[PDB]
């Protein structure tokens, strides 16, 4: 139920304990007026400080002038903050606007085409994103809906994705959640307590080349459909061999406990864990923060199921790209398809009550 | 933590409203009555396991390596989470298996209502399973595994995820708010009101269809909200649509949510005034719906609304008269019914030897 502090050197919703629910929206910018966009960033930041404390935006949800629309849409009245975090990111396409071309970080790389990609252009890209995570889905929807309303005329929602349940962990002391393939997902991540690893692998440093990004991060989002029909007819041995961990405990093959260290040479050469492990990728390490989704049926008599994969890293070129390139031969490829993609530069934190989202860029 | 599966009635109607919903409609692909009976029995055995927080069949792991696991494993480590699974039979089922003369008269086809825009792909269905639980992964796991068990005899026609309150953060005697920001459920049948359930919800032997005694009839309507239109309405316009104020949810001219309405103080086409039993010859419903938010549509608008579920003793004397009276509802400006289905929900599973549909099939 508790609030997560909004202010800091970093944005919340990265290193923060992973909340149960996601509402992710990508927006395109429709104004060419730099001042109007800056004004929106400040208004959004004011709104975020209310939302993340469990207060209504503006003058509230009722008790205003009868003849005016309420400032807050009202559907979160009476609810707790529910660990709401709101994390903003800027897409490569933003930097074609407002005279920003030379401020595009080098670490904000366009992804190459990967084998098996089938990206829907409508559900890819975006000038900016707001990741809303909370333990209560209504708290999350309310936040996105109110930001979008505030931004009417200046931004439009390009695409959105709801995540019903987490498939990631930044808290190794708590139970690791399972994805819809039935495997624990997040055992070997970066914990929010591992300050050293976060500095090394997640946060952008001044020396990395883009001063406005110091204390920020870079985000890859991949919408991945799961072929659950195909998977569910696979044997238990096939499923475990795909990953290199057992299904029940989620231990590395041959070992007894989830958190025992993998012995990679005992795994199949195309096992997912073997291919994705930092030791297989010159040390490349990622903060995974994904969620599961289901968007109805596929119209062929089956449930639609997927994973909305979210990875944070210090540089896309040294994080997600080398790892996913190594997954070219992954056994898991038989059971998944990447159907949406976007990258974002996640700026530094809102330092105090006088700061605002994007202040270091603008 | 768990809701008993067995009883004179199915759970998931009069039992406490859980925080999450996964509702699936299925179509039957077999013509063999024996094969369908066999499926109902296997489903009933699976439901008994699922609602006690156990895996289906021989489990999710620890079987024969070369066999697919019986349970897909994504609920391992979760609690039962007050899961209830409620089955219903659509009118189209009765054209199979020689059941045409056992269709209840109370299982009426709905008339076309003014402003209906029903998507045929997200309407109807031979049968439904309503899975309610506090943890949406428990609900999804249930649906996924029933669908798997039934593969070859049934397919999933459509499905819907929903949310109500989050019980860990929100007191249970608090009325939830719908996505228009109004309290929703203040004047409803409560599962404590045994005599009102007998009068208005449960089918009786004398009603004309003996196999349905202790069952009920379900109407499902997928009702989209025009969120962005609504949010531009004045507070006075919003309150005038309902006949209650937004902050407290009191009837106009009254002070508290639970004060009894004075219908003449409301506008003639206010929703509460039109839907109230006194405006409908005493017709009263048990509402048990959930909010949804599915994502954003092609225009950048929020695909959100109310997955409305009503239980009643007879569709002709419950939903039909009430929805007919909403022809002129002030709310119609802001909503559209886009999917519909009706089901006969049979009596409960009496004990460990009984099975879903036993009173119909023998
Ligand atoms: C539907 C898609 C995927 C599924 C089901 C999945 C599943 C898993 C599972 C079960 C683990 C083992 C437990 C763990 O340490 O988290 C794992 C580990 C991992 N995955 Fe994936 N994953 C998927 C996609 C991806 C993608 C797209 C990437 C990166 C490009 C990735 C990178 C990793 C990494 C880095 C690990 C940890 C390896 C280690 O250090 O031991 N995964 N995944
Ligand atoms: C999106 C669609 C709808 C919304 C947002 C909505 C909202 C509300 C709200 C705010 C109330 C007042 C509080 C309470 O629950 O008592 C209400 C009452 C009610 N609604 Fe609706 N409703 C919708 C659709 C329907 C439909 C389709 C029916 C039935 C056909 C219906 C039947 C009722 C009834 C029977 C009451 C209680 C009236 C009374 O006895 O005081 N509603 N609804």
mmCIF file of C-alpha atoms and ligand atoms in Angstrom, chain A residues 167 176 179-181 183-189 222 224-226 243 245 250 258 261-262 264 272-279 281 284-286 288 306-307 309 311 319-321 323-325 327 330 332 335-336 338, ligand 1:
data_model
loop_
_atom_site.group_PDB
_atom_site.id
_atom_site.type_symbol
_atom_site.label_atom_id
_atom_site.label_comp_id
_atom_site.label_asym_id
_atom_site.label_seq_id
_atom_site.Cartn_x
_atom_site.Cartn_y
_atom_site.Cartn_z
ATOM 1 C CA UNK A 167 7.903 -11.776 -14.572
ATOM 2 C CA UNK A 176 10.770 -15.215 -7.868
ATOM 3 C CA UNK A 179 6.218 -16.455 -16.538
ATOM 4 C CA UNK A 180 3.403 -18.130 -18.535
ATOM 5 C CA UNK A 181 5.750 -20.886 -19.608
ATOM 6 C CA UNK A 183 9.395 -21.048 -15.194
ATOM 7 C CA UNK A 184 10.710 -18.689 -12.532
ATOM 8 C CA UNK A 185 11.916 -15.539 -14.234
ATOM 9 C CA UNK A 186 14.298 -13.084 -12.492
ATOM 10 C CA UNK A 187 16.572 -15.360 -10.421
ATOM 11 C CA UNK A 188 19.797 -13.903 -11.787
ATOM 12 C CA UNK A 189 19.014 -10.219 -12.215
ATOM 13 C CA UNK A 222 10.126 -6.011 -26.619
ATOM 14 C CA UNK A 224 7.085 -11.150 -27.262
ATOM 15 C CA UNK A 225 4.285 -13.547 -28.193
ATOM 16 C CA UNK A 226 4.551 -17.077 -26.770
ATOM 17 C CA UNK A 243 16.239 -23.135 -20.282
ATOM 18 C CA UNK A 245 17.073 -24.958 -15.155
ATOM 19 C CA UNK A 250 14.289 -23.446 -10.968
ATOM 20 C CA UNK A 258 17.224 -21.924 -7.354
ATOM 21 C CA UNK A 261 25.225 -20.719 -9.370
ATOM 22 C CA UNK A 262 24.793 -22.135 -12.885
ATOM 23 C CA UNK A 264 27.064 -23.630 -17.831
ATOM 24 C CA UNK A 272 18.610 -19.975 -22.901
ATOM 25 C CA UNK A 273 20.443 -19.437 -19.608
ATOM 26 C CA UNK A 274 23.716 -20.559 -21.140
ATOM 27 C CA UNK A 275 23.360 -18.122 -24.062
ATOM 28 C CA UNK A 276 22.107 -15.152 -21.999
ATOM 29 C CA UNK A 277 24.512 -15.461 -19.054
ATOM 30 C CA UNK A 278 27.026 -12.567 -18.676
ATOM 31 C CA UNK A 279 29.944 -15.060 -18.884
ATOM 32 C CA UNK A 281 28.508 -12.314 -23.440
ATOM 33 C CA UNK A 284 27.154 -7.964 -20.473
ATOM 34 C CA UNK A 285 24.517 -7.744 -17.735
ATOM 35 C CA UNK A 286 20.957 -6.369 -17.844
ATOM 36 C CA UNK A 288 15.184 -7.196 -16.498
ATOM 37 C CA UNK A 306 3.055 -13.119 -24.108
ATOM 38 C CA UNK A 307 5.805 -11.423 -22.194
ATOM 39 C CA UNK A 309 10.129 -7.711 -21.911
ATOM 40 C CA UNK A 311 15.443 -4.257 -19.940
ATOM 41 C CA UNK A 319 23.609 -4.543 -22.816
ATOM 42 C CA UNK A 320 20.603 -5.786 -24.786
ATOM 43 C CA UNK A 321 22.224 -5.891 -28.267
ATOM 44 C CA UNK A 323 22.831 -10.573 -25.405
ATOM 45 C CA UNK A 324 20.003 -10.758 -27.962
ATOM 46 C CA UNK A 325 22.535 -11.287 -30.766
ATOM 47 C CA UNK A 327 20.236 -15.616 -28.589
ATOM 48 C CA UNK A 330 18.449 -20.113 -28.513
ATOM 49 C CA UNK A 332 13.568 -20.776 -26.829
ATOM 50 C CA UNK A 335 8.392 -20.964 -28.812
ATOM 51 C CA UNK A 336 8.452 -17.153 -29.075
ATOM 52 C CA UNK A 338 9.215 -10.721 -31.050
HETATM 53 C C1 LIG C 1 9.467 -14.874 -23.574
HETATM 54 C C2 LIG C 1 10.728 -14.596 -23.464
HETATM 55 C C3 LIG C 1 11.644 -15.128 -22.439
HETATM 56 C C4 LIG C 1 11.464 -16.049 -21.432
HETATM 57 C C5 LIG C 1 10.302 -16.909 -21.203
HETATM 58 C C6 LIG C 1 12.646 -16.042 -20.597
HETATM 59 C C7 LIG C 1 12.854 -16.928 -19.562
HETATM 60 C C8 LIG C 1 13.994 -16.956 -18.747
HETATM 61 C C9 LIG C 1 14.210 -17.780 -17.627
HETATM 62 C C10 LIG C 1 13.224 -18.852 -17.133
HETATM 63 C C11 LIG C 1 15.421 -17.477 -17.108
HETATM 64 C C12 LIG C 1 16.035 -18.222 -15.909
HETATM 65 C C13 LIG C 1 15.855 -17.539 -14.517
HETATM 66 C C14 LIG C 1 16.508 -16.189 -14.477
HETATM 67 O O1 LIG C 1 17.719 -16.089 -14.108
HETATM 68 O O2 LIG C 1 15.831 -15.191 -14.712
HETATM 69 C C15 LIG C 1 15.940 -16.428 -17.929
HETATM 70 C C16 LIG C 1 17.165 -15.813 -17.704
HETATM 71 C C17 LIG C 1 17.652 -14.782 -18.457
HETATM 72 N N1 LIG C 1 17.121 -14.203 -19.530
HETATM 73 FE FE1 LIG C 1 15.389 -14.771 -20.400
HETATM 74 N N2 LIG C 1 13.470 -15.120 -21.098
HETATM 75 C C18 LIG C 1 12.955 -14.564 -22.180
HETATM 76 C C19 LIG C 1 13.495 -13.569 -22.952
HETATM 77 C C20 LIG C 1 14.742 -12.948 -22.763
HETATM 78 C C21 LIG C 1 15.310 -11.976 -23.599
HETATM 79 C C22 LIG C 1 14.665 -11.312 -24.795
HETATM 80 C C23 LIG C 1 16.473 -11.647 -23.009
HETATM 81 C C24 LIG C 1 17.525 -10.765 -23.357
HETATM 82 C C25 LIG C 1 17.792 -10.340 -24.577
HETATM 83 C C26 LIG C 1 16.715 -12.460 -21.856
HETATM 84 C C27 LIG C 1 17.835 -12.431 -20.971
HETATM 85 C C28 LIG C 1 17.945 -13.232 -19.874
HETATM 86 C C29 LIG C 1 19.120 -13.167 -18.968
HETATM 87 C C30 LIG C 1 20.234 -12.146 -19.093
HETATM 88 C C31 LIG C 1 18.891 -14.130 -18.042
HETATM 89 C C32 LIG C 1 19.790 -14.457 -16.894
HETATM 90 C C33 LIG C 1 20.961 -15.359 -17.308
HETATM 91 C C34 LIG C 1 21.915 -15.536 -16.141
HETATM 92 O O3 LIG C 1 22.699 -14.622 -15.850
HETATM 93 O O4 LIG C 1 21.918 -16.587 -15.429
HETATM 94 N N3 LIG C 1 15.609 -13.236 -21.746
HETATM 95 N N4 LIG C 1 15.040 -16.120 -18.963
#
